[PDB]
Amino acid sequence: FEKHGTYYEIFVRSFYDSDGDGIGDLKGIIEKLDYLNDGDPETIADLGVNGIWLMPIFKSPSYHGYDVTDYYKINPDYGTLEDFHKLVEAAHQRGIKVIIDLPINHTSERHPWFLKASRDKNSEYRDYYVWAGPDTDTKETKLDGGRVWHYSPTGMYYGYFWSGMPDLNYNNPEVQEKVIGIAKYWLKQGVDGFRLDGAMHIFPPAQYDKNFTWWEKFRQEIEEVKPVYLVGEVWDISETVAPYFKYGFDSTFNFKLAEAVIATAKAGFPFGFNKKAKHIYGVYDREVGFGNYIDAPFLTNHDQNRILDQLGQDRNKARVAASIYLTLPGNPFIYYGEEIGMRGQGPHEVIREPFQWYNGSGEGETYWEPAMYNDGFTSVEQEEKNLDSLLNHYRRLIHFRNENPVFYTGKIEIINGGLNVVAFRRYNDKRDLYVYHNLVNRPVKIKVASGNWTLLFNSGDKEITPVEDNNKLMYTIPAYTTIVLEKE
Ligand SMILES: [Ca+2]
Numbered sequence: 057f058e059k060h061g062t063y064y065e066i067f068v069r070s071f072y073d074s075d076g077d078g079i080g081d082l083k084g085i086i087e088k089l090d091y092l093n094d095g096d097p098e099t100i101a102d103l104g105v106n107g108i109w110l111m112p113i114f115k116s117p118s119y120h121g122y123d124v125t126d127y128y129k130i131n132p133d134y135g136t137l138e139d140f141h142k143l144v145e146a147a148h149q150r151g152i153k154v155i156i157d158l159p160i161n162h163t164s165e166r167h168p169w170f171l172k173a174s175r176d177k178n179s180e181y182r183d184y185y186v187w188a189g190p191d192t193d194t195k196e197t198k199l200d201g202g203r204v205w206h207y208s209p210t211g212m213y214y215g216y217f218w219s220g221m222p223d224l225n226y227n228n229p230e231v232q233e234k235v236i237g238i239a240k241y242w243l244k245q246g247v248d249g250f251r252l253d254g255a256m257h258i259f260p261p262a263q264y265d266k267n268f269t270w271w272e273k274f275r276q277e278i279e280e281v282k283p284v285y286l287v288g289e290v291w292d293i294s295e296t297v298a299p300y301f302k303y304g305f306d307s308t309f310n311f312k313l314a315e316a317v318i319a320t321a322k323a324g325f326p327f328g329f330n331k332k333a334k335h336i337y338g339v340y341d342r343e344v345g346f347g348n349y350i351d352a353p354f355l356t357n358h359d360q361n362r363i364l365d366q367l368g369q370d371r372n373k374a375r376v377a378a379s380i381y382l383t384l385p386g387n388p389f390i391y392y393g394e395e396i397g398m399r400g401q402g403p404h405e406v407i408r409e410p411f412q413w414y415n416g417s418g419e420g421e422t423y424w425e426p427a428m429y430n431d432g433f434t435s436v437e438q439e440e441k442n443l444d445s446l447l448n449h450y451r452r453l454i455h456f457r458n459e460n461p462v463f464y465t466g467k468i469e470i471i472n473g474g475l476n477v478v479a480f481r482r483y484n485d486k487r488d489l490y491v492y493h494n495l496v497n498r499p500v501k502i503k504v505a506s507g508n509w510t511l512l513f514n515s516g517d518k519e520i521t522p523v524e525d526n527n528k529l530m531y532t533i534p535a536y537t538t539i540v541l542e543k544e
């Protein structure tokens with residue numbers, strides 16, 4: 057069970073519509089699988105990703121699905137269980153692992169369990185949720201609203217995010233059993249793992265360690281079915297994220313490093329990235345140990361303003377940002393649309409706009425909401441016209457990564473590549489690669505000690521030939537370009 061690979065995050069509703077109702081669905085993903093990975097490592101006609109993560113696919117009243125009403129039923133909007141099985145089979149045929157979002161931290165207020173527990177204090181499901189006693193304080197800020205305690209005819213219940221999302225009571229052994237059963241069910245349907253929210257607010261501050269006890273039990277029990285891949289979201293500093301690598305998770309999303317990559321690509325100076333990367337990998341190596349964690353680097357996801365927007369809609373800077381994280385250790389995660397330069401900021405609905413397949417309209421393109429910001433802005437059709445497009449840039453980076461696995465499992469050492477360059481070595485006992493990323497709109501020069509060096513990768517379409525003088529090999533890197541050298 058190979059856990060290393062580049063992942064692609066898909067919002068089913070916005071990917072591909074196979075039956076003409078404007079809503080993206082599972083059969084649609086099947087129809088477009090070759091775009092992600094055609095199963096042939098010899099071609100670069102596909103992105104080359106080896107895993108896909110589907111945002112919530114269970115029954116739910118919302119367009120996003122994070123508030124589940126039935127964990128054993130596929131949202132009709134996305135298709136059927138049969139479609140899901142055909143997708144898992146088609147993906148495996150191509151070497152693509154499939155993981156799905158598992159919203160088990162809370163349920164929808166419309167979930168039967170809650171409806172029953174909320175309409176009878178003596179209900180059999182009463183203890184599936186958390187019911188108040190003292191203080192209905194309410195801590196506030198963030199982006200949503202406020203209050204963690206809410207009214208419900210038979211008492212007030214706990215709901216960290218929103219009254220529509222009551223939190224499940226993990227202090228109840230039955231809740232833990234039920235959720236594990238749900239996970240096992242989907243694994244038996246063919247899934248390879250899950251994407252999970254690691255923070256569980258039902259545990260009072262005094263029971264923080266119960267979080268790790270829970271995830272360890274969860275992983276141990278579900279792997280009784282088969283080996284799995286688990287990636288968790290823990291939106292906090294690296295010191296807080298680190299232990300999760302030890303108690304059940306293979307990977308965790310590197311939010312802090314994402315912020316640094318974005319800031320550095322925007323500014324054109326490597327300081328921020330250099331300092332943050334050294335700190336974070338240092339924390340992970342100290343608390344977990346190199347080789348005992350699979351980081352999940354990324355730029356932006358389904359809850360954040362798209363990378364292009366964060367870079368002032370500068371496609372060149374977005375290109376550099378892509379080269380940087382796609383050459384980092386671990387399993388990189390690509391947010392759908394990122395590879396063709398989609399834009400979107402503000403409302404989560406905008407960030408989750410329909411994926412653009414065509415310049416204009418065409419069969420399969422979703423339209424459940426207006427494509428206000430991307431219609432006519434970018435598309436796969438347009439990106440396919442030139443071998444040096446952003447889409448082809450992503451294809452080249454991912455395939456290069458797959459052809460040189462040291463990028464997944466090797467160590468990393470930040471080095472000084474100059475005032476406007478992010479540089480680092482990716483290495484193991486057999487490969488010693490030097491990676492250089494030009495962050496600005498002008499050529500930059502880098503020098504290495506005279507010796508046996510080989511140019512392995514050039515992200516641009518220009519001829520890059522080094523010159524040797526006074527025992528130093530000098531390379532002039534064109535604007536926003538990345539190169540990889542091998543030292544022997
Ligand atoms: Ca459809």
Ligand SMILES: [Ca+2]
Nearest residue numbers: 096097099100
């Ligand atoms: Ca291929």
